[PDB]
mmCIF file of C-alpha atoms and ligand atoms in Angstrom:
data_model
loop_
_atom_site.group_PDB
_atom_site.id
_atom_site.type_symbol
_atom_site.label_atom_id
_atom_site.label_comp_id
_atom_site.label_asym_id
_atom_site.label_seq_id
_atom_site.Cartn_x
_atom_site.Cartn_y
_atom_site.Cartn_z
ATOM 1 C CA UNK A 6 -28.281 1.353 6.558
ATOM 2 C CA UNK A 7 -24.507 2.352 6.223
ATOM 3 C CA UNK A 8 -23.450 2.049 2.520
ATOM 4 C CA UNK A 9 -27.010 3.527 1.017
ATOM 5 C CA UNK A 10 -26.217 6.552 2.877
ATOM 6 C CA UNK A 11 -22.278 6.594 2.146
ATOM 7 C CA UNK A 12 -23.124 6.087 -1.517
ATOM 8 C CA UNK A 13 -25.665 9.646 -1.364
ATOM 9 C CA UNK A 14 -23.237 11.828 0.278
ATOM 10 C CA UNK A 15 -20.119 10.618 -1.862
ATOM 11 C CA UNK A 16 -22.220 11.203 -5.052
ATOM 12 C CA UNK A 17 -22.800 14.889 -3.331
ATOM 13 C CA UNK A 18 -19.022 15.991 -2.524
ATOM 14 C CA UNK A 19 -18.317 14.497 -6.458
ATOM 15 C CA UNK A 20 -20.947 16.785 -7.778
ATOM 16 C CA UNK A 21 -19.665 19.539 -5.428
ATOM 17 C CA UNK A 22 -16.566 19.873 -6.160
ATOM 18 C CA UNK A 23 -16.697 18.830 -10.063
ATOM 19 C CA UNK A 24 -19.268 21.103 -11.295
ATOM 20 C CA UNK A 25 -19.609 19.604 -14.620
ATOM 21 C CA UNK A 26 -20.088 16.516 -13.701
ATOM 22 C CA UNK A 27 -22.970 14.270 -13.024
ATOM 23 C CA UNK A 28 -22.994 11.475 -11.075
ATOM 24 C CA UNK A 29 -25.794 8.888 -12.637
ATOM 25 C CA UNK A 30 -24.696 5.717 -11.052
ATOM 26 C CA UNK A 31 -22.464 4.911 -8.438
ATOM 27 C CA UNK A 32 -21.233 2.705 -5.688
ATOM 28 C CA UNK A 33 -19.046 1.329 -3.060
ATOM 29 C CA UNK A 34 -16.495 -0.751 -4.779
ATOM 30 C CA UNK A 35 -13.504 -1.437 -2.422
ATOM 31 C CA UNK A 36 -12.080 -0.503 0.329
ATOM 32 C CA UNK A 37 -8.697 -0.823 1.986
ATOM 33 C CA UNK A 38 -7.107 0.998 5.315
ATOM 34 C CA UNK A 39 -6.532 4.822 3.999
ATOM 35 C CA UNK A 40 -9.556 4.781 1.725
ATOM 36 C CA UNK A 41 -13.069 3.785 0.484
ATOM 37 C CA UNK A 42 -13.202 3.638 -3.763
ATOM 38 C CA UNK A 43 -16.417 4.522 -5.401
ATOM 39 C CA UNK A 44 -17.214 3.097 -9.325
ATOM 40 C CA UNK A 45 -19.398 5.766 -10.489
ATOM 41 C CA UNK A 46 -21.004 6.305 -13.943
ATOM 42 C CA UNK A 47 -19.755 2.319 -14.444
ATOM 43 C CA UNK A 48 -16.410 4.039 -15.884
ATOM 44 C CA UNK A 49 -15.177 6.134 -13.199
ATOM 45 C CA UNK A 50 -12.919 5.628 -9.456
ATOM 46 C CA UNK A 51 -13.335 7.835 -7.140
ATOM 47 C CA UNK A 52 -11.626 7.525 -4.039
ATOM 48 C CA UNK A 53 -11.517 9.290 -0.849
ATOM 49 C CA UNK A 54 -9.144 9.218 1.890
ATOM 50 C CA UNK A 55 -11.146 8.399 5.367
ATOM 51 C CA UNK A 56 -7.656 7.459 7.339
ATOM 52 C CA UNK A 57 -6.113 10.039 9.440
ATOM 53 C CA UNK A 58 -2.407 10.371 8.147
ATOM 54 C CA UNK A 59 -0.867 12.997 6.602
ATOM 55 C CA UNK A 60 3.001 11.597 5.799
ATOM 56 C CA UNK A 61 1.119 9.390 2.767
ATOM 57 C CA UNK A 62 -1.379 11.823 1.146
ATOM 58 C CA UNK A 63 -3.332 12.433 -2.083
ATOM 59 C CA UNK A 64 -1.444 15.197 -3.135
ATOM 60 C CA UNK A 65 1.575 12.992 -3.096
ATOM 61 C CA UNK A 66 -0.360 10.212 -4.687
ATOM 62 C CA UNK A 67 -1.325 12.501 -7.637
ATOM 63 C CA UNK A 68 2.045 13.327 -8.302
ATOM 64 C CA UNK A 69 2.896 10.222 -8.862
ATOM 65 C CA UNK A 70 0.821 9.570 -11.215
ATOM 66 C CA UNK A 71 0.998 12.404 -12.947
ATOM 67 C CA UNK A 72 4.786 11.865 -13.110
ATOM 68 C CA UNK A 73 4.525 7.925 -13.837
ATOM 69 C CA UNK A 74 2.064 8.200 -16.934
ATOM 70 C CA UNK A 75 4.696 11.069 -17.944
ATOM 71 C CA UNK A 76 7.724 9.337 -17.809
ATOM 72 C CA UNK A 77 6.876 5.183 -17.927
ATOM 73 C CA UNK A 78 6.788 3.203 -21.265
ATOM 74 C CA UNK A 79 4.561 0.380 -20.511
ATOM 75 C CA UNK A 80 1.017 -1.092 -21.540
ATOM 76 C CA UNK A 81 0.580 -1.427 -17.801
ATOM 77 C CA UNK A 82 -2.312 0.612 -17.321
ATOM 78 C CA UNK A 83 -2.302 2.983 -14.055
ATOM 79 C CA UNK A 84 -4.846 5.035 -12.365
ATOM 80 C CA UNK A 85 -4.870 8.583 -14.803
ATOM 81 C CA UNK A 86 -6.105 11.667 -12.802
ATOM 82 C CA UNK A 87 -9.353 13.285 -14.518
ATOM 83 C CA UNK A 88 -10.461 14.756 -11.228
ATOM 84 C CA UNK A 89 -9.090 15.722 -7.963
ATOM 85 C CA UNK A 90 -9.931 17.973 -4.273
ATOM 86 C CA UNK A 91 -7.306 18.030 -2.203
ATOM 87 C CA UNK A 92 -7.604 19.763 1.130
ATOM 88 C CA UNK A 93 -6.405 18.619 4.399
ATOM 89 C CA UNK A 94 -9.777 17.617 5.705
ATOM 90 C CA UNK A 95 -10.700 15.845 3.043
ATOM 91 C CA UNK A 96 -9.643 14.634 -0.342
ATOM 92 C CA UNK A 97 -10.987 13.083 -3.813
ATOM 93 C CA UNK A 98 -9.349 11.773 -6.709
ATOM 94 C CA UNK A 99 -11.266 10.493 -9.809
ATOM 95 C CA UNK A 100 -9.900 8.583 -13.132
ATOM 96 C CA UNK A 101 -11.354 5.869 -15.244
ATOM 97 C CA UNK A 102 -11.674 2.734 -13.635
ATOM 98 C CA UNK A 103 -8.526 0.016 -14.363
ATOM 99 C CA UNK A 104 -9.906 -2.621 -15.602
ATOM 100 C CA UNK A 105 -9.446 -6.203 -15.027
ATOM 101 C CA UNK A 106 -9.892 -9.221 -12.763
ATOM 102 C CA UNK A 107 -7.305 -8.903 -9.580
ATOM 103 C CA UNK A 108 -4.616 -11.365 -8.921
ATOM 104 C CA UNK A 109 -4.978 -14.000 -6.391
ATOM 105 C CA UNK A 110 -3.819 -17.009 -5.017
ATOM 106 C CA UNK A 111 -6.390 -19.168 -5.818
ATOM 107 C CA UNK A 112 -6.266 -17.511 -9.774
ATOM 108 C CA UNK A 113 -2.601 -18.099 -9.845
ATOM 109 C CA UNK A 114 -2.390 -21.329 -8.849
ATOM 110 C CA UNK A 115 -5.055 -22.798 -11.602
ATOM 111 C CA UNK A 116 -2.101 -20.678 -14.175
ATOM 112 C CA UNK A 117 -0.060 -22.534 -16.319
ATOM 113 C CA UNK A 118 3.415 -22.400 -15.585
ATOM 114 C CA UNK A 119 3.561 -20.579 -19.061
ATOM 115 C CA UNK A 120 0.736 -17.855 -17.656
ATOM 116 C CA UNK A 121 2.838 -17.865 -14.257
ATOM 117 C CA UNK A 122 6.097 -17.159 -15.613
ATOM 118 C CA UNK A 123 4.713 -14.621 -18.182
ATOM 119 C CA UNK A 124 2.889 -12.798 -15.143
ATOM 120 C CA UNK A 125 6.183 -12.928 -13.461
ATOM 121 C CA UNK A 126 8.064 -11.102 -16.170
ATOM 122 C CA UNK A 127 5.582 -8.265 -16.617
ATOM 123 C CA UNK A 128 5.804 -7.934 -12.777
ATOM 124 C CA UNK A 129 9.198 -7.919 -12.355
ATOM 125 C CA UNK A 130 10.031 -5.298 -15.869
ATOM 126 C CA UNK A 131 7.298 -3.091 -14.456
ATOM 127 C CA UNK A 132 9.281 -3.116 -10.638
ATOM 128 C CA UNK A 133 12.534 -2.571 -13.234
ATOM 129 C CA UNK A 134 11.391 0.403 -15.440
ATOM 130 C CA UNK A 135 9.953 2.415 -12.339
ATOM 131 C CA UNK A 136 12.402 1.458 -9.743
ATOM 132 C CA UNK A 137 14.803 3.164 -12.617
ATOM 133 C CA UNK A 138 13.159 6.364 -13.597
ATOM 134 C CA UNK A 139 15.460 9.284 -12.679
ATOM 135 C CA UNK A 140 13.040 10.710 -10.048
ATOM 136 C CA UNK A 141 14.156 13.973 -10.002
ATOM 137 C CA UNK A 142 10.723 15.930 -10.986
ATOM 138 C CA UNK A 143 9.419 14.018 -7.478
ATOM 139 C CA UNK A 144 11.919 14.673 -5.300
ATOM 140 C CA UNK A 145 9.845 15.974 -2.693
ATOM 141 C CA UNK A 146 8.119 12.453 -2.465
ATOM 142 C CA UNK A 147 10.702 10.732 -0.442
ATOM 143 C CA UNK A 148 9.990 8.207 2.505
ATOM 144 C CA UNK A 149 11.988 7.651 5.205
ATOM 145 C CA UNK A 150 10.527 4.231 6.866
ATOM 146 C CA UNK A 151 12.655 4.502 10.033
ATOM 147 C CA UNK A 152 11.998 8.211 10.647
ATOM 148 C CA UNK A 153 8.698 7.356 10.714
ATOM 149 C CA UNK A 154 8.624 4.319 13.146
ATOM 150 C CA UNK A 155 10.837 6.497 15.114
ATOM 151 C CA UNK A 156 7.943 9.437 15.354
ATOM 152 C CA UNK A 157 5.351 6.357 15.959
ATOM 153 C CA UNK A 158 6.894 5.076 18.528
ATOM 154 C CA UNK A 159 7.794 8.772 20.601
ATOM 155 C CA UNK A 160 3.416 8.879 19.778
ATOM 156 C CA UNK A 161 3.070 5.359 21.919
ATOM 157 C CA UNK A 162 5.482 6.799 24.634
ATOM 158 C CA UNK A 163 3.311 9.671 24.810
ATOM 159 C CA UNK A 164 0.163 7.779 24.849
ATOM 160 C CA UNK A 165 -0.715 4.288 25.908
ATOM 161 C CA UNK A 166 3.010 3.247 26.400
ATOM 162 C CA UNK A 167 2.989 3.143 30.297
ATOM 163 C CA UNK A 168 -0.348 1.319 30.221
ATOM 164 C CA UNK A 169 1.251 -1.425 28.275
ATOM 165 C CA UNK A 170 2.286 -4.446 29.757
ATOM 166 C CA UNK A 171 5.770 -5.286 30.073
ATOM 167 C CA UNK A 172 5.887 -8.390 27.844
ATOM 168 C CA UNK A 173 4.409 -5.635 25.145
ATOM 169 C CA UNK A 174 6.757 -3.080 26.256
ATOM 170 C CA UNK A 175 9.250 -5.705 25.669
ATOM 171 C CA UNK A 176 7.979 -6.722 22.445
ATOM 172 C CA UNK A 177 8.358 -3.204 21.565
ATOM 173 C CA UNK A 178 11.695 -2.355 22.839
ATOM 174 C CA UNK A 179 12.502 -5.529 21.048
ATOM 175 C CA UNK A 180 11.621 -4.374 17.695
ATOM 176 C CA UNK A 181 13.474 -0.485 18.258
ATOM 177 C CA UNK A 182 16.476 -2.050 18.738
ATOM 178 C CA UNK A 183 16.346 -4.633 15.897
ATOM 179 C CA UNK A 184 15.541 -1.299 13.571
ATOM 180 C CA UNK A 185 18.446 0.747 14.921
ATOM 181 C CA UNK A 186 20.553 -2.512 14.192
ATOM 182 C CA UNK A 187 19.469 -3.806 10.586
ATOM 183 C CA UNK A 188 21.362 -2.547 7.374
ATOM 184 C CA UNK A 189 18.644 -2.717 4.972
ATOM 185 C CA UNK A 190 17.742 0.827 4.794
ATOM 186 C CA UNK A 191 21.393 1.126 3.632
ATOM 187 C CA UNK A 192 20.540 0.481 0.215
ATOM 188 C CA UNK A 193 19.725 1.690 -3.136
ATOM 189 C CA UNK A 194 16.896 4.365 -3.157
ATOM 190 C CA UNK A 195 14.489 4.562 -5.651
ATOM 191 C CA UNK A 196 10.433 5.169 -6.323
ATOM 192 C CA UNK A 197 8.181 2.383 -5.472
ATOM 193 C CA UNK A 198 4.404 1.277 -5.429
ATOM 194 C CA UNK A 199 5.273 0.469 -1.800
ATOM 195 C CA UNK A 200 2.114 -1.332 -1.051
ATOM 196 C CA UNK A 201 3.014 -4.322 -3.919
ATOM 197 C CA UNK A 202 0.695 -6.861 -3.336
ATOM 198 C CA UNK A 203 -1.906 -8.951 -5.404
ATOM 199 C CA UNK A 204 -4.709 -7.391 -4.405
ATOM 200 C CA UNK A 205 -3.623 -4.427 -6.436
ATOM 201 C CA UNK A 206 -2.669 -6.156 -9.259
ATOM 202 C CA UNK A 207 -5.072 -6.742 -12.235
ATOM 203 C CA UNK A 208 -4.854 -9.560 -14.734
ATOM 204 C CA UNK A 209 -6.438 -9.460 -18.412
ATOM 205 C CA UNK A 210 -8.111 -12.198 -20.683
ATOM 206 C CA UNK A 211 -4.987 -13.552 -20.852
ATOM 207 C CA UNK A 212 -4.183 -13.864 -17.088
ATOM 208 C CA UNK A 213 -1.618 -11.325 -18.038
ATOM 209 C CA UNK A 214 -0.661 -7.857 -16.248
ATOM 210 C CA UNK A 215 -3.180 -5.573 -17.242
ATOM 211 C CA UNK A 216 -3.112 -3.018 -14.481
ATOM 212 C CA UNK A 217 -1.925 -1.254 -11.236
ATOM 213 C CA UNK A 218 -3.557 0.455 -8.694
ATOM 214 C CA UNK A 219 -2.880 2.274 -5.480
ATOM 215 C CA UNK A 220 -0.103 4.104 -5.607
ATOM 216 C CA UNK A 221 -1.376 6.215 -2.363
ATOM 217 C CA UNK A 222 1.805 4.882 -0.312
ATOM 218 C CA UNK A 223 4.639 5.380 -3.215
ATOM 219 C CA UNK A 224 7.406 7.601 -2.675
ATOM 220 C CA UNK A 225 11.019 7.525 -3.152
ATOM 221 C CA UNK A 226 12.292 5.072 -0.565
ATOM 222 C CA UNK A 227 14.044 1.379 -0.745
ATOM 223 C CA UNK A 228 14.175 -0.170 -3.637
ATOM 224 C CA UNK A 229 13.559 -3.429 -1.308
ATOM 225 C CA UNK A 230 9.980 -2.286 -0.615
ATOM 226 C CA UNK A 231 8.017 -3.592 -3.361
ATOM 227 C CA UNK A 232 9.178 -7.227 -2.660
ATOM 228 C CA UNK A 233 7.626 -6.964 1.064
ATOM 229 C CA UNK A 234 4.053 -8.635 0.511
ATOM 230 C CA UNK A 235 5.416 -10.874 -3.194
ATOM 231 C CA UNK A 236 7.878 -12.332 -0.316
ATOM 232 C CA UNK A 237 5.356 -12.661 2.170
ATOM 233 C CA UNK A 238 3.928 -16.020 3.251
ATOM 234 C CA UNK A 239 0.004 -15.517 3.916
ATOM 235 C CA UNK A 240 -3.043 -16.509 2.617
ATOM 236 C CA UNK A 241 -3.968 -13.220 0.447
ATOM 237 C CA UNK A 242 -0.550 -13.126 -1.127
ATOM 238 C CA UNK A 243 0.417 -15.857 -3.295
ATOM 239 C CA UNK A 244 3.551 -17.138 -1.240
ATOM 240 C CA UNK A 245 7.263 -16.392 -0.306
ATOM 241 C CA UNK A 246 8.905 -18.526 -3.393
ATOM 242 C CA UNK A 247 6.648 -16.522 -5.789
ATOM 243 C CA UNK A 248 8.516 -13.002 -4.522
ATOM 244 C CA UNK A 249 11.970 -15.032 -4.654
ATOM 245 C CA UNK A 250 10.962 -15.844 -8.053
ATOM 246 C CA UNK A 251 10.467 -12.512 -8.948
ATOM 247 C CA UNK A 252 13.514 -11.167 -6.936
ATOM 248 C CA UNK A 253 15.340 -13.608 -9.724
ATOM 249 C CA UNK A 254 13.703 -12.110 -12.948
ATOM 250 C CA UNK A 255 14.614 -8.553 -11.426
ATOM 251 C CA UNK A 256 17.688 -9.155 -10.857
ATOM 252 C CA UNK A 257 20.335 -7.125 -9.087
ATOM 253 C CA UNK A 258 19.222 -7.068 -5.656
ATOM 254 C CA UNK A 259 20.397 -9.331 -2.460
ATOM 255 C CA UNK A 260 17.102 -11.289 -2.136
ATOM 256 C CA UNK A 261 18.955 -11.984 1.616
ATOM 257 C CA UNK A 262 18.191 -8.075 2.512
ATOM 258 C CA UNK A 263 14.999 -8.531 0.923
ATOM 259 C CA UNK A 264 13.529 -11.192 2.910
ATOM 260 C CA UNK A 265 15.312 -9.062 5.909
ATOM 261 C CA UNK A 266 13.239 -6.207 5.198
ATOM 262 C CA UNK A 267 9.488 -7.817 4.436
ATOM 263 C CA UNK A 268 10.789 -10.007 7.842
ATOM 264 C CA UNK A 269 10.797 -6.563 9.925
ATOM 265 C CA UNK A 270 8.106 -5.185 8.577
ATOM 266 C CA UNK A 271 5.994 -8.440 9.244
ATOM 267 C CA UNK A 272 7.202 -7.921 13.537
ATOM 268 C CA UNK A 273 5.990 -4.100 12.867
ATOM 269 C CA UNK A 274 2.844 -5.105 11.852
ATOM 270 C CA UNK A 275 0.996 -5.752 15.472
ATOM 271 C CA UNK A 276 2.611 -2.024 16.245
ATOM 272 C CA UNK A 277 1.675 -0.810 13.334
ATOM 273 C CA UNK A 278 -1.956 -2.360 13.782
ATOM 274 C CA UNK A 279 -1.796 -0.725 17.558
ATOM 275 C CA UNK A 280 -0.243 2.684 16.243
ATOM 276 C CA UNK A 281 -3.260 2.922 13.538
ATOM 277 C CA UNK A 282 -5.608 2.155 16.215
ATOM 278 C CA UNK A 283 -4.220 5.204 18.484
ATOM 279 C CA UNK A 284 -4.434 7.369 15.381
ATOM 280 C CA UNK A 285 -7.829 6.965 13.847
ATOM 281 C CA UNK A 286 -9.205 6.243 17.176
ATOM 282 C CA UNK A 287 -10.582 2.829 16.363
ATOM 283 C CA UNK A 288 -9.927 0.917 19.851
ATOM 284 C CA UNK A 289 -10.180 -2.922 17.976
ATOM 285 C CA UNK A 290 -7.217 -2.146 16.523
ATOM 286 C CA UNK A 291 -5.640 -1.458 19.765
ATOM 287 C CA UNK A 292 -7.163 -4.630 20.978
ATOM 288 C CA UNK A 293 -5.808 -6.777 17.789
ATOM 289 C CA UNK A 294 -2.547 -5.376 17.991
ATOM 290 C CA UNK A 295 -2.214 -6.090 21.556
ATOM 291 C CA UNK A 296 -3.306 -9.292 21.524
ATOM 292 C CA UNK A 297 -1.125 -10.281 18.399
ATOM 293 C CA UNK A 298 1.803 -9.302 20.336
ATOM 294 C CA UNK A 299 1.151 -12.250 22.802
ATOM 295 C CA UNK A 300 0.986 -14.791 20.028
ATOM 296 C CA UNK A 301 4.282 -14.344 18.722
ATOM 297 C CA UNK A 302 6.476 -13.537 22.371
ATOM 298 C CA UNK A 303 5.251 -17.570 22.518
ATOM 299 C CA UNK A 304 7.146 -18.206 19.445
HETATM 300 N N1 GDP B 401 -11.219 -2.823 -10.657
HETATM 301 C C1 GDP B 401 -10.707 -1.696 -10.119
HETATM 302 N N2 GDP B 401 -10.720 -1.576 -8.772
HETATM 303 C C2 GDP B 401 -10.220 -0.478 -8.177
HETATM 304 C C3 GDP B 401 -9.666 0.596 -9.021
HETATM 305 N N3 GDP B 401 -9.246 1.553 -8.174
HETATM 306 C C4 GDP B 401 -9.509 1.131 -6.905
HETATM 307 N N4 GDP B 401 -10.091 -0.082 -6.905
HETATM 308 C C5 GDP B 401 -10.530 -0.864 -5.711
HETATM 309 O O1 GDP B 401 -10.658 -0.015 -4.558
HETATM 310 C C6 GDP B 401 -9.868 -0.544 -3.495
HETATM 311 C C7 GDP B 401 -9.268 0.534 -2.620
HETATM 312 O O2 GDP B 401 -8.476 1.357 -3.482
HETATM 313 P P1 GDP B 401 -6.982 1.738 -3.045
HETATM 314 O O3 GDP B 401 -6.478 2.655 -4.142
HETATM 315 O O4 GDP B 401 -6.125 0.482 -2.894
HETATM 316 O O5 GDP B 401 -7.191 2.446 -1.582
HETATM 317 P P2 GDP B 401 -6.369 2.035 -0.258
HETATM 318 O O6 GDP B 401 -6.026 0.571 -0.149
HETATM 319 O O7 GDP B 401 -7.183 2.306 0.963
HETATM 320 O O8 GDP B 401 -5.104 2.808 -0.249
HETATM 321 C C8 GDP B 401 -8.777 -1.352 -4.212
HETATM 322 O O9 GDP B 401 -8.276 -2.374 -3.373
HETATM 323 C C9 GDP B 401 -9.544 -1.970 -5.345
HETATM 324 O O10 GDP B 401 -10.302 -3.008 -4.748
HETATM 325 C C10 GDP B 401 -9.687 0.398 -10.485
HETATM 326 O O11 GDP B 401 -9.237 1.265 -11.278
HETATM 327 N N5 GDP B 401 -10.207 -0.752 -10.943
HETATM 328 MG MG1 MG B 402 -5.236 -0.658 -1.436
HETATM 329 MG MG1 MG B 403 -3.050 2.480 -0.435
#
């Protein structure tokens, strides 16, 4: 009985390493690939990082948002740091809970145009204000995107690589060479969310932007980043002509290199799927990611 008994030990660390306070309710929440969130006391988030990676950490994640309720004018509520352990084993951060109903498809398609276009203005002046912030007090919080592909791949050649087949070898080689080709890391630098999609995104009353969350991946890297998943075309993000749209409102960007980046990202994703798999040890990911490579070398 999984959750009853990750529920009692998460209420134990909290009460650990926050002496003052007392956990009276709590439980599991959310979840996504780094971490698992906890709503405890029916006011509080904490989270705690269960992914083995150390490039996109909490310590990083609470200095940006530390610096970002320091230097952002908005009524965009973020995540505010009350509480925090951070050690490499393991690490908590705790803050009262955003609150809101998250974005989706389905709620954004039952929007008036009015409510759409509204939504799409708060998103893209919130993308404006932070993507501008002199980031000078977070320097240290740069992300290089193909410096890190780079060390993931040297991990596959000195792991699984020579077990792979060759159409997955090739699928591989493919995508190195397409990365040491494309221009789009060329570009204007700046700090981003960097993991910008709906599912983070929370909508008030009014179907208007209320809050952001998860800003465990945001550094200083391309500005072209937080258009990857508005731009992508799935069925958990609300489609490609909704992160055009958005790209428009912006403003100032070539919505060309745009779509160029979220379009190599999207033929990392079965590596990156294979490369978290080798890391955290979780062999279905392997599997997934292997697999997914066959379905798209047959276009
Ligand atoms: N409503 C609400 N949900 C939250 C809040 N913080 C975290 N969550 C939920 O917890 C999930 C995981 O948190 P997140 O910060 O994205 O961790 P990660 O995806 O693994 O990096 C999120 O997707 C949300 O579902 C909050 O302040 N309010
Ligand atoms: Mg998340
Ligand atoms: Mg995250």
């Amino acid at each position: 009985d999984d959750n009853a008994t990750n529920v009692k030990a998460m209420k134990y660390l909290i009460e650990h390493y926050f002496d003052n306070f007392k956990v009276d309710s709590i439980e599991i929440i959310g979840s996504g690939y780094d971490s698992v969130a906890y709503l405890v006391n029916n006011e509080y988030i904490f989270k705690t990082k269960f992914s083995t990676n150390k490039k996109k950490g909490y310590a990083k994640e609470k200095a940006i948002y530390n610096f970002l309720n320091t230097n952002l004018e908005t009524n965009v509520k973020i995540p505010n740091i009350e509480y925090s352990y951070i050690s490499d084993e393991l690490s908590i951060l705790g803050y009262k809970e955003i609150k809101g109903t998250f974005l989706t498809p389905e709620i954004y398609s039952t929007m008036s145009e009015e409510e759409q276009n509204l939504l799409k203005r708060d998103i893209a002046s919130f993308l404006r204000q932070m993507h501008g912030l002199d980031y000078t007090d977070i320097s240290e919080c740069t992300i290089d995107n193909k410096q890190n592909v780079l060390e993931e791949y040297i991990l596959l050649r000195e792991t699984i690589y020579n077990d792979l087949t060759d159409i997955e070898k090739d699928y591989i080689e493919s995508f190195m060479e397409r990365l040491n080709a494309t221009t789009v890391f060329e570009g204007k630098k700046c700090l981003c969310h960097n993991d910008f999609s709906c599912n983070h995104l929370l909508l008030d009353g009014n179907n208007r932007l209320t809050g952001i969350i998860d800003f465990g991946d945001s550094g200083i890297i391309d500005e072209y980043c937080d258009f990857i998943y508005l731009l992508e075309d799935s069925e958990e993000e609300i489609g490609t002509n909704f992160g055009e749209d958005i790209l428009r409102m912006y403003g100032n960007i070539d919505i060309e290199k745009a779509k160029e980046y979220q379009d190599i990202v999207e033929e990392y994703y079965p590596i990156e799927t294979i490369v978290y798999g080798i890391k955290n040890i979780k062999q279905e990911f392997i599997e997934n990611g292997r697999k997914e490579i066959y379905k798209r070398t047959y276009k």
